[PDB]
């Protein structure tokens, strides 16, 4: 099935956000990213996607449909606003093997704080 995500300049958690920021899906599902405001895109973060999944990067302002195949956790960012915290976590299948690794990886402090919130309060 399909899960729709919006990219906004301002939302529930503050400025520059993906809503929802926690996406639960299964292999074969699609995630459709819709920039409701301009200036946003979606890009997989290096070493924060599962082992055999392909990297991806959409163009700014375009609607992008991601098909997810490999199970595991994926942290995606908005390229321009990553440093301002704009990320989302996609969890494919149950108990994603790489989730603790992604939570521990090096990333901006603001990113880390939002990630922690979404895993607690968004799961």
């Amino acid at each position: 099935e399909n899960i729709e995500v919006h990219m906004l300049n301002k939302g529930a958690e503050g400025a520059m956000v993906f809503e929802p920021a926690y996406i639960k899906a299964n292999p074969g599902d699609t995630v459709t990213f819709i920039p409701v405001d301009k200036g946003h895109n979606v890009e997989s973060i290096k070493d924060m996607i599962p082992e055999g999944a392909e990297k991806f990067k959409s163009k700014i302002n375009e609607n992008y449909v991601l098909t997810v195949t490999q199970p595991g956790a994926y942290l995606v960012k908005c390229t321009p606003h990553y440093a301002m915290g704009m990320i989302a976590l996609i969890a494919v299948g149950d108990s994603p093997a790489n989730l603790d690794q992604i939570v521990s990886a090096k990333k901006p402090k603001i990113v880390q704080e939002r990630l922690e919130k979404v895993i607690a309060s968004a799961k």
Partner: protein, 336 residues
């Protein structure tokens, strides 16, 4: 100059102070070109702006709105080490209008919490200019939050009028004006939050109205009055730099005037003279020099009377000295 030539120039570290005061500096350059070094940590916290306890999540360079005024001469290179502490939650960046290349330094200074960088640019044009953070996609928000100040690159030989005479000031103050946009609830009371991002959507709605709920100087209504009222004595010359990095203002010293005022904030451009009220366009800092001739309390504020008395754009300078009747005298005091 080549990299080798720049590496052999003398470097001078400068300690910045908090507005409206400026750090120590000589009008006339002492020596040739030198790489001036200044460091400012950004602190996003909550500052009260009025007596009603209104609060704005300020993003402040050096912990003060507006950031501190850096002062170097033309030709000297300003090297600024910025640091965004892990305690913050948003990535910033600094774009100095007085620089050339990389969106004013914003394209090479994006640093997220826990990151610091160092950018050095040559000050090739003389004049006050406004610097301000502008992260791609959230520029207006960071500037309105109080993330902007101004630097003054003074001519190697100091300042001079339009004919070439030297104008030297005994005191210089920097008043950064800031127009905020605070969200209110249904009853009209300002709303307060707990984090900076929680007030982003509500703030944008107010910013679109192009109508600031408060326009003040130094980050708060009544900030430069009382214990902060500037000071000057009859016979003293004072240069008052003023900057607005998100709104046009019109400075006016009540009881005095801008003898010489570089409205455009560019020294090469001749300074208007005998000015009652000047005009500085959003995104620009100017400067006015005036020699006080009468003692007493004078208010200095954005003429928009509404913006200066109802919003909060009015400061006050206390001046000491002897009154001069020749200039003004009450022949008949108010009576029946």
């Amino acid at each position: 100059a080549t990299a080798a030539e720049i590496a052999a120039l003398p470097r001078q570290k400068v300690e910045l102070v908090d507005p409206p005061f400026v750090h120590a500096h000589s009008q006339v350059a002492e020596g040739g070109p030198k790489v001036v070094e200044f460091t400012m940590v950004i602190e996003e916290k909550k500052i009260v702006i009025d007596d009603a306890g209104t609060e704005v999540h300020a993003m402040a360079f050096n912990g003060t709105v507006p950031g501190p005024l850096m002062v170097v001469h033309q030709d000297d290179y300003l090297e600024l080490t910025l640091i965004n502490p892990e305690t913050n939650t948003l990535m910033h960046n600094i774009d100095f209008h007085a620089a050339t290349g990389a969106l004013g330094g914003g394209g090479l200074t994006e640093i997220n919490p826990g990151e610091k960088t160092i950018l050095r640019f040559k000050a090739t044009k003389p004049g006050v200019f406004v610097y301000h953070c502008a992260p791609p996609g959230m520029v207006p928000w960071h500037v309105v939050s109080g993330m902007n100040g101004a630097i003054m690159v003074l001519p190697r030989e100091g300042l001079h009028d339009g004919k070439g005479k030297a104008l030297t000031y005994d005191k210089i103050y920097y008043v950064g004006e800031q127009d905020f946009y605070v969200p209110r609830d249904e009853n009209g009371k300002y709303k307060k939050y707990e984090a900076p991002g929680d007030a982003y959507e509500d703030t944008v709605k107010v910013m679109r109205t192009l109508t600031p709920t408060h326009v003040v100087f130094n980050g708060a209504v009544g900030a430069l009055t009382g214990d902060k009222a500037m000071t000057a004595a009859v016979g003293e010359k004072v240069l008052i730099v003023h900057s607005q990095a998100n709104r046009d203002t019109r400075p006016h010293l009540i009881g005095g005037h801008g003898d010489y005022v570089w409205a455009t904030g560019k020294f090469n451009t001749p300074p208007d003279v005998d000015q009652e009220t000047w005009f500085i366009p959003g995104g620009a800092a100017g400067a006015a020099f005036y020699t006080f001739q009468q003692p007493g309390i004078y208010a200095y504020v954005n003429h928009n009377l509404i913006e200066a008395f109802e919003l909060g754009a009015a400061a006050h300078f206390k001046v000491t000295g002897e009154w001069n009747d020749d200039l003004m005298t009450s022949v008949l005091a108010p009576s029946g």
